[PDB]
Structure 1
Amino acid sequence: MKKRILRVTFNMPYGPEVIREDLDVRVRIMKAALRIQNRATMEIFGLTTQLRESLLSQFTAWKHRQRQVGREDELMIKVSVEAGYSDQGREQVSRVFVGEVAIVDIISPPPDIGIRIQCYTRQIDRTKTIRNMPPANTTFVKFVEWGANEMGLNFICDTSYNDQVLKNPGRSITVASAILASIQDMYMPDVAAFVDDDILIVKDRDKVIRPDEVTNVNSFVGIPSWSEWGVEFQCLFEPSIRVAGGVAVESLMNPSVNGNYVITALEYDLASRDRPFYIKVMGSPAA
Protein backbone atom coordinates (compact mmCIF):
# COMPACT_ATOMS: atom_id res chain seq x y z
CA MET A 1 0.00 0.00 0.00
CA LYS A 2 1.97 2.96 -1.34
CA LYS A 3 2.10 6.17 0.70
CA ARG A 4 2.17 9.71 -0.67
CA ILE A 5 5.09 12.10 -0.16
CA LEU A 6 4.88 15.89 0.04
CA ARG A 7 7.75 18.15 1.12
CA VAL A 8 7.89 21.95 1.20
CA THR A 9 11.30 23.58 1.60
CA PHE A 10 12.17 27.11 2.73
CA ASN A 11 15.62 28.64 2.18
CA MET A 12 15.87 30.63 5.39
CA PRO A 13 19.09 32.56 6.12
CA TYR A 14 20.38 29.93 8.56
CA GLY A 15 19.51 27.06 6.22
CA PRO A 16 16.69 24.93 4.84
CA GLU A 17 13.53 24.24 6.84
CA VAL A 18 11.56 21.31 5.42
CA ILE A 19 7.92 20.75 6.35
CA ARG A 20 7.47 17.00 6.00
CA GLU A 21 4.34 15.18 4.87
CA ASP A 22 3.42 14.13 8.42
CA LEU A 23 1.57 17.42 9.01
CA ASP A 24 -1.55 18.81 7.34
CA VAL A 25 -0.45 20.51 4.11
CA ARG A 26 -2.61 21.41 1.11
CA VAL A 27 -1.23 22.95 -2.09
CA ARG A 28 -2.79 24.12 -5.36
CA ILE A 29 -0.53 24.86 -8.34
CA MET A 30 -1.51 26.36 -11.69
CA LYS A 31 0.85 26.53 -14.67
CA ALA A 32 0.22 27.65 -18.23
CA ALA A 33 2.03 28.75 -21.39
CA LEU A 34 1.67 32.49 -20.85
CA ARG A 35 3.61 35.50 -19.60
CA ILE A 36 1.61 35.61 -16.35
CA GLN A 37 3.70 33.89 -13.71
CA ASN A 38 2.73 30.66 -11.99
CA ARG A 39 1.00 30.62 -8.62
CA ALA A 40 0.78 28.34 -5.59
CA THR A 41 -1.54 28.65 -2.58
CA MET A 42 -0.44 26.72 0.49
CA GLU A 43 -2.35 25.60 3.58
CA ILE A 44 -0.22 24.70 6.60
CA PHE A 45 -1.75 23.49 9.87
CA GLY A 46 -0.35 22.78 13.31
CA LEU A 47 2.63 25.14 13.28
CA THR A 48 3.88 25.70 16.82
CA THR A 49 4.94 28.98 18.40
CA GLN A 50 8.60 28.28 17.59
CA LEU A 51 8.03 27.65 13.89
CA ARG A 52 5.47 30.44 13.61
CA GLU A 53 8.06 32.83 15.04
CA SER A 54 10.79 31.46 12.78
CA LEU A 55 8.84 31.60 9.50
CA LEU A 56 5.96 34.09 9.55
CA SER A 57 8.23 37.01 10.49
CA GLN A 58 10.36 36.74 7.32
CA PHE A 59 7.60 37.54 4.78
CA THR A 60 7.88 41.20 5.73
CA ALA A 61 7.39 42.88 2.29
CA TRP A 62 9.09 46.01 3.62
CA LYS A 63 12.76 46.74 2.87
CA HIS A 64 15.61 46.42 5.34
CA ARG A 65 19.33 46.94 4.71
CA GLN A 66 19.07 50.02 2.51
CA ARG A 67 22.74 49.57 1.60
CA GLN A 68 21.59 46.37 -0.16
CA VAL A 69 24.73 44.26 -0.40
CA GLY A 70 23.94 41.85 -3.22
CA ARG A 71 20.38 41.08 -4.30
CA GLU A 72 17.95 38.14 -4.63
CA ASP A 73 17.83 36.45 -1.22
CA GLU A 74 18.29 39.76 0.63
CA LEU A 75 14.73 40.70 -0.39
CA MET A 76 12.42 37.68 -0.12
CA ILE A 77 12.88 34.00 0.68
CA LYS A 78 12.41 31.12 -1.76
CA VAL A 79 10.19 28.03 -1.57
CA SER A 80 10.54 24.73 -3.44
CA VAL A 81 7.90 21.98 -3.63
CA GLU A 82 8.43 18.29 -4.38
CA ALA A 83 5.73 15.61 -4.44
CA GLY A 84 5.59 11.91 -5.18
CA TYR A 85 4.89 8.43 -3.86
CA SER A 86 6.84 5.97 -1.72
CA ASP A 87 6.67 2.18 -1.87
CA GLN A 88 8.51 -0.20 0.48
CA GLY A 89 10.85 2.66 1.30
CA ARG A 90 11.60 3.16 -2.41
CA GLU A 91 10.85 6.72 -3.50
CA GLN A 92 9.74 8.44 -6.69
CA VAL A 93 9.76 12.09 -5.58
CA SER A 94 9.73 14.88 -8.17
CA ARG A 95 9.84 18.68 -8.16
CA VAL A 96 6.82 20.67 -9.29
CA PHE A 97 7.26 24.33 -8.26
CA VAL A 98 9.81 27.02 -7.35
CA GLY A 99 8.86 30.48 -6.16
CA GLU A 100 8.93 33.19 -3.52
CA VAL A 101 6.39 34.10 -0.85
CA ALA A 102 4.22 37.14 -1.58
CA ILE A 103 1.14 37.21 0.70
CA VAL A 104 0.46 35.88 4.21
CA ASP A 105 -2.80 35.30 6.08
CA ILE A 106 -4.38 33.46 8.99
CA ILE A 107 -7.23 31.12 8.11
CA SER A 108 -8.29 28.95 11.00
CA PRO A 109 -8.55 30.08 14.63
CA PRO A 110 -7.49 28.00 17.63
CA PRO A 111 -7.37 25.18 18.65
CA ASP A 112 -5.75 24.50 15.24
CA ILE A 113 -3.96 27.56 13.84
CA GLY A 114 -3.54 27.42 10.07
CA ILE A 115 -2.00 29.84 7.61
CA ARG A 116 -2.35 30.51 3.89
CA ILE A 117 0.56 31.56 1.68
CA GLN A 118 0.83 32.80 -1.92
CA CYS A 119 3.95 32.04 -3.97
CA TYR A 120 4.94 33.20 -7.45
CA THR A 121 7.69 32.04 -9.79
CA ARG A 122 10.46 34.51 -10.68
CA GLN A 123 8.98 37.25 -8.54
CA ILE A 124 12.52 38.40 -7.71
CA ASP A 125 12.58 40.18 -11.08
CA ARG A 126 9.85 42.65 -10.14
CA THR A 127 12.50 44.52 -8.11
CA LYS A 128 15.68 43.94 -10.13
CA THR A 129 16.30 46.43 -12.94
CA ILE A 130 18.12 46.26 -16.30
CA ARG A 131 21.80 47.21 -16.46
CA ASN A 132 22.76 45.77 -19.87
CA MET A 133 21.72 47.72 -22.94
CA PRO A 134 19.32 45.77 -25.18
CA PRO A 135 20.46 45.04 -28.75
CA ALA A 136 19.51 47.78 -31.20
CA ASN A 137 19.10 46.04 -34.58
CA THR A 138 19.05 42.26 -34.38
CA THR A 139 17.09 39.09 -35.03
CA PHE A 140 14.56 37.35 -32.78
CA VAL A 141 16.88 34.67 -31.41
CA LYS A 142 19.51 37.15 -30.26
CA PHE A 143 16.85 39.17 -28.45
CA VAL A 144 15.73 36.00 -26.69
CA GLU A 145 19.33 35.15 -25.77
CA TRP A 146 19.95 38.62 -24.34
CA GLY A 147 16.76 38.38 -22.29
CA ALA A 148 17.74 34.97 -20.95
CA ASN A 149 21.17 36.22 -19.91
CA GLU A 150 19.68 39.32 -18.29
CA MET A 151 17.14 37.38 -16.23
CA GLY A 152 19.64 34.64 -15.39
CA LEU A 153 17.84 31.61 -16.80
CA ASN A 154 18.80 28.76 -19.09
CA PHE A 155 16.76 29.15 -22.26
CA ILE A 156 15.60 27.09 -25.22
CA CYS A 157 14.20 28.71 -28.37
CA ASP A 158 12.78 26.86 -31.37
CA THR A 159 10.53 28.92 -33.67
CA SER A 160 10.00 29.35 -37.38
CA TYR A 161 10.53 33.09 -36.74
CA ASN A 162 14.20 32.66 -35.83
CA ASP A 163 15.55 34.71 -38.77
CA GLN A 164 13.48 37.90 -38.57
CA VAL A 165 15.06 41.31 -38.01
CA LEU A 166 13.59 43.54 -35.30
CA LYS A 167 14.21 47.27 -34.80
CA ASN A 168 14.35 48.67 -31.25
CA PRO A 169 12.88 45.58 -29.57
CA GLY A 170 13.32 46.42 -25.90
CA ARG A 171 14.01 50.13 -25.61
CA SER A 172 11.08 50.75 -23.22
CA ILE A 173 11.56 48.12 -20.51
CA THR A 174 11.91 49.42 -16.96
CA VAL A 175 12.44 46.22 -14.92
CA ALA A 176 13.39 42.61 -15.57
CA SER A 177 9.79 41.34 -15.65
CA ALA A 178 8.56 43.11 -18.80
CA ILE A 179 11.14 41.22 -20.88
CA LEU A 180 8.76 38.26 -21.08
CA ALA A 181 5.85 40.48 -22.11
CA SER A 182 8.06 41.96 -24.82
CA ILE A 183 9.01 38.50 -26.08
CA GLN A 184 5.40 37.31 -26.18
CA ASP A 185 3.99 40.50 -27.69
CA MET A 186 5.69 40.43 -31.09
CA TYR A 187 4.29 37.25 -32.64
CA MET A 188 1.08 36.31 -30.89
CA PRO A 189 -0.60 33.91 -30.88
CA ASP A 190 1.50 31.35 -32.73
CA VAL A 191 4.63 32.06 -30.67
CA ALA A 192 4.18 31.21 -26.98
CA ALA A 193 6.78 32.39 -24.46
CA PHE A 194 6.69 31.31 -20.82
CA VAL A 195 9.02 30.70 -17.88
CA ASP A 196 8.77 27.26 -16.27
CA ASP A 197 10.74 26.44 -13.10
CA ASP A 198 14.13 27.85 -14.15
CA ILE A 199 13.91 27.59 -17.96
CA LEU A 200 12.68 30.22 -20.41
CA ILE A 201 10.86 28.47 -23.27
CA VAL A 202 9.97 30.15 -26.56
CA LYS A 203 8.40 27.97 -29.24
CA ASP A 204 5.66 27.63 -31.80
CA ARG A 205 2.24 26.69 -30.46
CA ASP A 206 2.05 23.11 -31.72
CA LYS A 207 5.63 21.84 -31.38
CA VAL A 208 6.70 19.33 -28.74
CA ILE A 209 9.94 20.45 -27.10
CA ARG A 210 11.23 16.88 -26.58
CA PRO A 211 9.95 14.71 -29.46
CA ASP A 212 11.24 11.43 -27.99
CA GLU A 213 9.82 11.79 -24.46
CA VAL A 214 6.15 11.24 -25.29
CA THR A 215 4.36 9.91 -22.22
CA ASN A 216 1.71 7.33 -23.06
CA VAL A 217 -1.38 7.77 -20.88
CA ASN A 218 -4.02 5.05 -20.60
CA SER A 219 -5.49 5.37 -17.07
CA PHE A 220 -7.65 8.44 -16.44
CA VAL A 221 -9.52 9.35 -13.28
CA GLY A 222 -11.29 12.09 -15.25
CA ILE A 223 -12.94 10.76 -18.40
CA PRO A 224 -11.40 12.45 -21.47
CA SER A 225 -13.63 14.73 -23.50
CA TRP A 226 -13.46 17.22 -26.34
CA SER A 227 -12.99 20.76 -25.02
CA GLU A 228 -13.00 23.21 -27.92
CA TRP A 229 -9.20 23.27 -28.27
CA GLY A 230 -8.21 19.60 -28.21
CA VAL A 231 -8.72 17.27 -25.24
CA GLU A 232 -8.92 17.75 -21.48
CA PHE A 233 -8.68 15.04 -18.83
CA GLN A 234 -7.42 14.27 -15.32
CA CYS A 235 -5.21 11.69 -13.65
CA LEU A 236 -3.37 10.86 -10.45
CA PHE A 237 0.07 12.33 -9.76
CA GLU A 238 2.15 11.40 -12.81
CA PRO A 239 5.69 12.83 -12.49
CA SER A 240 6.27 12.50 -16.24
CA ILE A 241 3.71 15.13 -17.24
CA ARG A 242 5.26 18.53 -17.97
CA VAL A 243 4.34 21.73 -19.80
CA ALA A 244 4.86 21.77 -23.60
CA GLY A 245 5.49 18.01 -23.53
CA GLY A 246 3.53 15.48 -25.54
CA VAL A 247 1.07 12.76 -24.52
CA ALA A 248 -0.29 9.71 -26.33
CA VAL A 249 -3.88 8.96 -25.32
CA GLU A 250 -5.74 5.64 -25.49
CA SER A 251 -9.24 5.57 -24.00
CA LEU A 252 -11.98 3.01 -23.38
CA MET A 253 -15.17 5.00 -22.79
CA ASN A 254 -14.21 7.58 -25.44
CA PRO A 255 -12.07 5.76 -28.04
CA SER A 256 -12.67 8.43 -30.70
CA VAL A 257 -10.32 10.93 -29.02
CA ASN A 258 -7.16 8.83 -29.30
CA GLY A 259 -4.13 10.65 -30.65
CA ASN A 260 -1.10 12.79 -29.86
CA TYR A 261 -1.58 16.06 -27.99
CA VAL A 262 0.72 18.84 -26.79
CA ILE A 263 0.19 20.06 -23.24
CA THR A 264 -0.99 23.66 -22.77
CA ALA A 265 -2.04 24.13 -19.13
CA LEU A 266 -1.77 22.12 -15.91
CA GLU A 267 -3.23 22.12 -12.41
CA TYR A 268 -2.05 20.33 -9.27
CA ASP A 269 -4.27 19.59 -6.25
CA LEU A 270 -2.05 17.80 -3.73
CA ALA A 271 -2.99 17.15 -0.10
CA SER A 272 -1.41 15.00 2.59
CA ARG A 273 -4.58 14.29 4.61
CA ASP A 274 -7.43 14.95 2.16
CA ARG A 275 -8.88 13.21 -0.87
CA PRO A 276 -7.48 15.41 -3.70
CA PHE A 277 -4.16 14.23 -5.13
CA TYR A 278 -4.64 14.96 -8.82
CA ILE A 279 -3.37 16.53 -12.04
CA LYS A 280 -5.57 18.22 -14.65
CA VAL A 281 -4.31 18.45 -18.24
CA MET A 282 -5.48 20.32 -21.33
CA GLY A 283 -3.94 19.64 -24.72
CA SER A 284 -3.82 20.77 -28.34
CA PRO A 285 -3.39 18.66 -31.48
CA ALA A 286 0.23 17.96 -32.37
CA ALA A 287 1.60 19.46 -35.57
Structure 2
Amino acid sequence: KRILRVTFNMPYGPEVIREDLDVRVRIMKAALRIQNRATMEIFGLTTQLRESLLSQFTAWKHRQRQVGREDELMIKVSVEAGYSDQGREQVSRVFVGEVAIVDIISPPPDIGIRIQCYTRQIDRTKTIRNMPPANTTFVKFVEWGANEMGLNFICDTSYNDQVLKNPGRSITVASAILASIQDMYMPDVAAFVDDDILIVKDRDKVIRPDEVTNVNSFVGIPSWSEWGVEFQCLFEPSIRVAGGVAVESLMNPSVNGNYVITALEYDLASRDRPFYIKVMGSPAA
Protein backbone atom coordinates (compact mmCIF):
# COMPACT_ATOMS: atom_id res chain seq x y z
CA LYS A 1 0.00 0.00 0.00
CA ARG A 2 1.68 3.17 -1.23
CA ILE A 3 0.70 6.25 0.76
CA LEU A 4 1.17 9.62 -0.96
CA ARG A 5 -0.12 12.97 0.30
CA VAL A 6 -0.02 16.46 -1.18
CA THR A 7 -0.50 18.93 1.69
CA PHE A 8 -1.22 22.53 0.73
CA ASN A 9 -1.16 25.52 3.09
CA MET A 10 -4.08 27.94 2.67
CA PRO A 11 -5.88 30.34 5.05
CA TYR A 12 -8.50 27.70 5.87
CA GLY A 13 -5.72 25.29 6.83
CA PRO A 14 -3.98 22.29 5.30
CA GLU A 15 -6.13 20.37 2.80
CA VAL A 16 -4.39 17.02 2.41
CA ILE A 17 -4.97 15.37 -0.96
CA ARG A 18 -4.62 11.66 -0.21
CA GLU A 19 -3.64 8.71 -2.40
CA ASP A 20 -7.27 7.71 -3.01
CA LEU A 21 -7.42 10.45 -5.63
CA ASP A 22 -5.30 9.78 -8.69
CA VAL A 23 -2.08 11.67 -7.98
CA ARG A 24 1.17 11.66 -9.94
CA VAL A 25 4.13 13.62 -8.56
CA ARG A 26 7.35 14.00 -10.56
CA ILE A 27 9.99 15.70 -8.41
CA MET A 28 13.39 16.55 -9.85
CA LYS A 29 16.06 17.79 -7.43
CA ALA A 30 19.75 18.43 -7.91
CA ALA A 31 22.81 20.03 -6.32
CA LEU A 32 22.60 23.23 -8.37
CA ARG A 33 21.58 26.84 -8.13
CA ILE A 34 18.36 25.86 -9.92
CA GLN A 35 15.17 25.53 -7.91
CA ASN A 36 14.10 21.91 -7.65
CA ARG A 37 10.85 21.20 -9.49
CA ALA A 38 7.69 19.25 -8.70
CA THR A 39 5.04 18.57 -11.35
CA MET A 40 1.94 17.02 -9.81
CA GLU A 41 -1.09 15.85 -11.79
CA ILE A 42 -4.16 15.41 -9.58
CA PHE A 43 -7.37 14.00 -11.05
CA GLY A 44 -10.73 13.47 -9.40
CA LEU A 45 -11.04 17.04 -8.13
CA THR A 46 -14.53 18.09 -7.12
CA THR A 47 -15.88 21.47 -8.15
CA GLN A 48 -15.53 22.79 -4.59
CA LEU A 49 -11.93 21.59 -4.22
CA ARG A 50 -11.04 23.06 -7.61
CA GLU A 51 -12.50 26.43 -6.62
CA SER A 52 -10.75 26.27 -3.24
CA LEU A 53 -7.31 25.54 -4.75
CA LEU A 54 -7.00 26.95 -8.28
CA SER A 55 -8.53 30.30 -7.35
CA GLN A 56 -5.91 30.76 -4.63
CA PHE A 57 -3.10 29.77 -7.01
CA THR A 58 -2.50 32.94 -9.04
CA ALA A 59 0.25 35.21 -10.33
CA TRP A 60 -1.77 38.40 -9.76
CA LYS A 61 -2.08 40.64 -6.67
CA HIS A 62 1.67 41.26 -6.92
CA ARG A 63 1.82 42.72 -10.45
CA GLN A 64 -1.40 44.70 -11.08
CA ARG A 65 -2.17 45.11 -7.36
CA GLN A 66 -0.26 45.25 -4.06
CA VAL A 67 -1.74 42.63 -1.64
CA GLY A 68 1.74 41.63 -0.51
CA ARG A 69 4.16 42.00 2.39
CA GLU A 70 5.06 38.46 3.59
CA ASP A 71 4.00 34.84 3.03
CA GLU A 72 0.41 33.89 2.10
CA LEU A 73 1.29 35.53 -1.23
CA MET A 74 1.63 32.10 -2.82
CA ILE A 75 0.50 28.76 -1.46
CA LYS A 76 3.27 26.62 0.01
CA VAL A 77 2.71 22.89 -0.53
CA SER A 78 4.63 19.91 0.83
CA VAL A 79 4.65 16.30 -0.37
CA GLU A 80 4.69 13.37 2.06
CA ALA A 81 5.25 9.93 0.55
CA GLY A 82 6.03 6.43 1.71
CA TYR A 83 4.73 2.94 2.37
CA SER A 84 2.40 1.45 4.97
CA ASP A 85 1.84 -2.16 6.01
CA GLN A 86 0.74 -3.95 9.20
CA GLY A 87 -0.41 -0.55 10.50
CA ARG A 88 2.99 1.18 10.56
CA GLU A 89 3.59 4.22 8.35
CA GLN A 90 6.68 5.41 6.49
CA VAL A 91 5.49 8.84 5.32
CA SER A 92 8.59 10.99 4.91
CA ARG A 93 8.78 14.39 3.19
CA VAL A 94 10.01 14.65 -0.40
CA PHE A 95 9.26 18.25 -1.45
CA VAL A 96 8.42 21.68 -0.04
CA GLY A 97 7.75 24.58 -2.39
CA GLU A 98 5.33 27.13 -3.77
CA VAL A 99 3.12 26.66 -6.82
CA ALA A 100 3.91 28.60 -9.97
CA ILE A 101 1.82 27.09 -12.79
CA VAL A 102 -1.73 25.71 -13.07
CA ASP A 103 -3.26 23.88 -16.03
CA ILE A 104 -5.49 20.96 -16.99
CA ILE A 105 -4.09 18.14 -19.09
CA SER A 106 -7.07 15.77 -19.08
CA PRO A 107 -10.47 17.20 -20.06
CA PRO A 108 -13.78 15.69 -18.87
CA PRO A 109 -15.03 13.23 -17.74
CA ASP A 110 -11.84 13.23 -15.61
CA ILE A 111 -11.10 16.89 -14.88
CA GLY A 112 -7.52 16.53 -13.71
CA ILE A 113 -5.32 19.50 -12.90
CA ARG A 114 -1.56 19.64 -13.45
CA ILE A 115 0.26 22.10 -11.22
CA GLN A 116 3.92 23.09 -11.21
CA CYS A 117 5.77 24.07 -8.02
CA TYR A 118 9.36 25.16 -7.43
CA THR A 119 11.25 25.22 -4.15
CA ARG A 120 11.74 28.76 -2.80
CA GLN A 121 9.33 30.51 -5.17
CA ILE A 122 9.23 33.45 -2.73
CA ASP A 123 11.98 35.09 -4.78
CA ARG A 124 9.92 38.30 -4.73
CA THR A 125 11.25 38.70 -1.20
CA LYS A 126 11.92 41.96 0.67
CA THR A 127 14.55 43.00 -1.91
CA ILE A 128 17.42 42.17 0.47
CA ARG A 129 16.58 43.66 3.87
CA ASN A 130 20.02 43.32 5.49
CA MET A 131 23.02 44.51 3.51
CA PRO A 132 25.60 41.87 2.50
CA PRO A 133 29.04 41.97 4.15
CA ALA A 134 31.60 44.49 2.92
CA ASN A 135 34.67 42.27 3.44
CA THR A 136 34.16 38.83 4.94
CA THR A 137 34.86 35.13 4.65
CA PHE A 138 32.88 32.65 2.58
CA VAL A 139 31.31 30.96 5.61
CA LYS A 140 30.08 34.30 6.92
CA PHE A 141 28.61 35.32 3.57
CA VAL A 142 26.85 31.93 3.53
CA GLU A 143 25.52 32.58 7.04
CA TRP A 144 24.23 35.98 5.94
CA GLY A 145 22.49 34.43 2.95
CA ALA A 146 20.90 31.72 5.08
CA ASN A 147 19.75 34.28 7.65
CA GLU A 148 18.26 36.48 4.92
CA MET A 149 16.41 33.55 3.36
CA GLY A 150 15.27 32.39 6.81
CA LEU A 151 16.61 28.86 6.32
CA ASN A 152 18.98 26.93 8.56
CA PHE A 153 22.31 26.19 6.91
CA ILE A 154 24.85 23.38 6.65
CA CYS A 155 28.22 24.86 5.63
CA ASP A 156 30.92 22.18 5.33
CA THR A 157 33.71 23.15 2.94
CA SER A 158 37.43 23.88 2.77
CA TYR A 159 36.85 27.33 1.23
CA ASN A 160 35.14 28.82 4.29
CA ASP A 161 38.17 30.76 5.56
CA GLN A 162 38.76 32.56 2.27
CA VAL A 163 38.15 36.28 2.40
CA LEU A 164 36.13 37.83 -0.38
CA LYS A 165 36.42 41.49 -1.14
CA ASN A 166 32.85 42.56 -1.81
CA PRO A 167 30.61 39.39 -1.88
CA GLY A 168 27.44 40.13 -3.78
CA ARG A 169 26.07 43.65 -3.53
CA SER A 170 24.67 43.36 -7.08
CA ILE A 171 22.07 40.90 -5.72
CA THR A 172 18.53 42.11 -6.39
CA VAL A 173 16.28 39.57 -4.61
CA ALA A 174 16.65 36.73 -2.12
CA SER A 175 16.75 34.00 -4.78
CA ALA A 176 19.84 35.45 -6.48
CA ILE A 177 21.76 34.84 -3.24
CA LEU A 178 21.89 31.12 -4.04
CA ALA A 179 23.00 31.89 -7.59
CA SER A 180 25.82 34.06 -6.22
CA ILE A 181 26.99 31.46 -3.69
CA GLN A 182 26.95 29.01 -6.59
CA ASP A 183 28.78 31.43 -8.90
CA MET A 184 31.80 31.94 -6.65
CA TYR A 185 34.06 28.88 -6.33
CA MET A 186 32.27 26.66 -8.78
CA PRO A 187 34.51 23.75 -9.80
CA ASP A 188 33.27 21.61 -6.91
CA VAL A 189 31.60 23.47 -4.04
CA ALA A 190 28.05 23.99 -5.30
CA ALA A 191 25.43 25.29 -2.88
CA PHE A 192 21.76 24.36 -3.05
CA VAL A 193 18.54 24.34 -1.02
CA ASP A 194 17.02 21.00 -0.03
CA ASP A 195 13.55 21.57 1.43
CA ASP A 196 14.17 24.23 4.10
CA ILE A 197 17.90 23.58 4.63
CA LEU A 198 20.55 25.49 2.68
CA ILE A 199 23.52 23.20 2.05
CA VAL A 200 26.90 24.63 1.01
CA LYS A 201 29.59 21.97 0.66
CA ASP A 202 32.15 20.47 -1.67
CA ARG A 203 30.71 18.19 -4.33
CA ASP A 204 32.88 15.24 -3.23
CA LYS A 205 31.83 15.38 0.44
CA VAL A 206 28.74 14.09 2.24
CA ILE A 207 26.50 16.24 4.43
CA ARG A 208 26.23 13.50 7.08
CA PRO A 209 28.96 10.83 7.02
CA ASP A 210 27.17 8.80 9.72
CA GLU A 211 24.02 8.66 7.53
CA VAL A 212 25.23 6.43 4.71
CA THR A 213 22.43 4.42 3.08
CA ASN A 214 23.38 0.83 2.28
CA VAL A 215 21.63 -0.06 -0.98
CA ASN A 216 21.34 -3.69 -2.08
CA SER A 217 18.08 -3.84 -4.04
CA PHE A 218 17.73 -1.82 -7.25
CA VAL A 219 15.25 -1.69 -10.13
CA GLY A 220 17.08 -2.64 -13.30
CA ILE A 221 20.85 -2.60 -12.82
CA PRO A 222 23.19 -0.08 -11.13
CA SER A 223 25.18 1.18 -14.10
CA TRP A 224 28.30 3.26 -14.58
CA SER A 225 28.20 6.88 -15.69
CA GLU A 226 30.50 9.75 -16.59
CA TRP A 227 31.04 10.70 -12.94
CA GLY A 228 29.91 7.81 -10.75
CA VAL A 229 27.10 5.27 -10.57
CA GLU A 230 23.50 5.83 -11.65
CA PHE A 231 20.68 3.64 -10.42
CA GLN A 232 16.94 3.51 -9.82
CA CYS A 233 15.30 2.19 -6.67
CA LEU A 234 11.94 1.76 -5.02
CA PHE A 235 10.96 4.58 -2.69
CA GLU A 236 13.06 4.48 0.47
CA PRO A 237 12.25 7.28 2.97
CA SER A 238 15.92 7.63 3.93
CA ILE A 239 17.55 8.91 0.71
CA ARG A 240 18.03 12.68 0.46
CA VAL A 241 19.93 14.92 -1.92
CA ALA A 242 23.72 14.94 -1.42
CA GLY A 243 23.49 12.04 1.02
CA GLY A 244 25.87 9.13 1.28
CA VAL A 245 25.11 5.83 -0.45
CA ALA A 246 26.84 2.46 -0.10
CA VAL A 247 25.89 0.68 -3.36
CA GLU A 248 26.33 -3.12 -3.17
CA SER A 249 25.25 -4.50 -6.53
CA LEU A 250 24.91 -8.02 -7.95
CA MET A 251 24.53 -7.65 -11.73
CA ASN A 252 27.42 -5.16 -11.85
CA PRO A 253 30.17 -6.03 -9.34
CA SER A 254 32.46 -3.14 -10.32
CA VAL A 255 30.05 -0.39 -9.20
CA ASN A 256 30.34 -1.38 -5.54
CA GLY A 257 31.60 1.40 -3.30
CA ASN A 258 30.61 4.57 -1.48
CA TYR A 259 28.96 7.38 -3.44
CA VAL A 260 27.56 10.82 -2.73
CA ILE A 261 24.34 11.93 -4.40
CA THR A 262 24.11 14.74 -6.94
CA ALA A 263 20.69 14.38 -8.60
CA LEU A 264 17.39 12.81 -7.56
CA GLU A 265 14.35 12.01 -9.73
CA TYR A 266 11.26 11.06 -7.75
CA ASP A 267 8.36 9.66 -9.79
CA LEU A 268 5.52 8.66 -7.44
CA ALA A 269 2.15 7.49 -8.78
CA SER A 270 -0.36 6.16 -6.26
CA ARG A 271 -2.66 4.72 -8.96
CA ASP A 272 0.01 3.84 -11.54
CA ARG A 273 3.14 1.74 -11.86
CA PRO A 274 5.92 4.38 -11.52
CA PHE A 275 6.89 4.69 -7.85
CA TYR A 276 10.65 4.94 -8.22
CA ILE A 277 13.45 7.31 -7.30
CA LYS A 278 16.43 7.66 -9.64
CA VAL A 279 19.79 8.54 -8.08
CA MET A 280 22.81 10.09 -9.78
CA GLY A 281 25.88 9.48 -7.66
CA SER A 282 29.56 10.35 -7.82
CA PRO A 283 32.56 8.93 -5.94
CA ALA A 284 32.76 10.17 -2.36
CA ALA A 285 35.95 11.65 -0.94
TM-score tier, shorter chain, comes to over 0.9
Helix, strand or coil: the match of 1:244?
coil
Cα gap change, 1:281/1:36 in structure 2, threshold over 3 Å: closer, same or farther? same
Q: Single out whichever of 83-92 and 121-130 deviates more from structure 2.
A: 121-130
| 1:123-175 Cα distance to aligned partner (Å, 9 max, x none) | 11234311211110111111111111111000010111111111111111111
Aligned-pair distance for 1:244?
1.1
- TM-score of the pair, normalised by structure 1: 0.96
Aligned-pair distance for 1:216?
0.5
Cα gap change, 1:191/1:65 in structure 2, threshold over 3 Å: closer, same or farther? closer
Cα gap change, 1:130/1:64 in structure 2, threshold over 3 Å: closer, same or farther? closer
Aligned-pair distance for 1:66?
9.0
Helix, strand or coil: the match of 1:217?
coil
Aligned-pair distance for 1:256?
1.4
CA contact 2:61–2:68 (8 Å) conserved in 1: no
CA contact 1:125–1:151 (8 Å) conserved in 2: no
The match for 1:188 is 186
Helix, strand or coil: the match of 2:82?
strand
Aligned-pair distance for 1:281?
0.5
Cα gap change, 1:28/1:166 in structure 2, threshold over 3 Å: closer, same or farther? same
The match for 2:59 is 61
Aligned-pair distance for 1:90?
1.2
Cα gap change, 1:141/1:64 in structure 2, threshold over 3 Å: closer, same or farther? closer
Structure 2: distance between partners of 1:239 and 1:171: 39
Helix, strand or coil: the match of 2:96?
strand
CA contact 2:4–2:18 (8 Å) conserved in 1: yes
Structure 1: distance between partners of 2:50 and 2:177: 37
| 1:216-256 Cα distance to aligned partner (Å, 9 max, x none) | 00001120111111100111001111111111111111111
Percent identical among aligned pairs is 100
Helix, strand or coil: the match of 1:223?
strand
Helix, strand or coil: the match of 1:107?
strand
Helix, strand or coil: the match of 1:212?
helix
- TM-score of the pair, normalised by structure 2: 0.96
Helix, strand or coil: the match of 1:85?
strand
Helix, strand or coil: the match of 2:100?
strand
The match for 2:177 is 179
What residue ranges of structure 1 are gaps of 5+ in the alignment? none
Aligned residues: 285
RMSD: 1.5
Structure 2: distance between partners of 1:266 and 1:143: 27
Structure 2: distance between partners of 1:131 and 1:41: 32
Quick one: which of 12, 24, 27 aligns to 2:10? 12
Structure 1: distance between partners of 2:184 and 2:250: 42
CA contact 2:10–2:72 (8 Å) conserved in 1: no
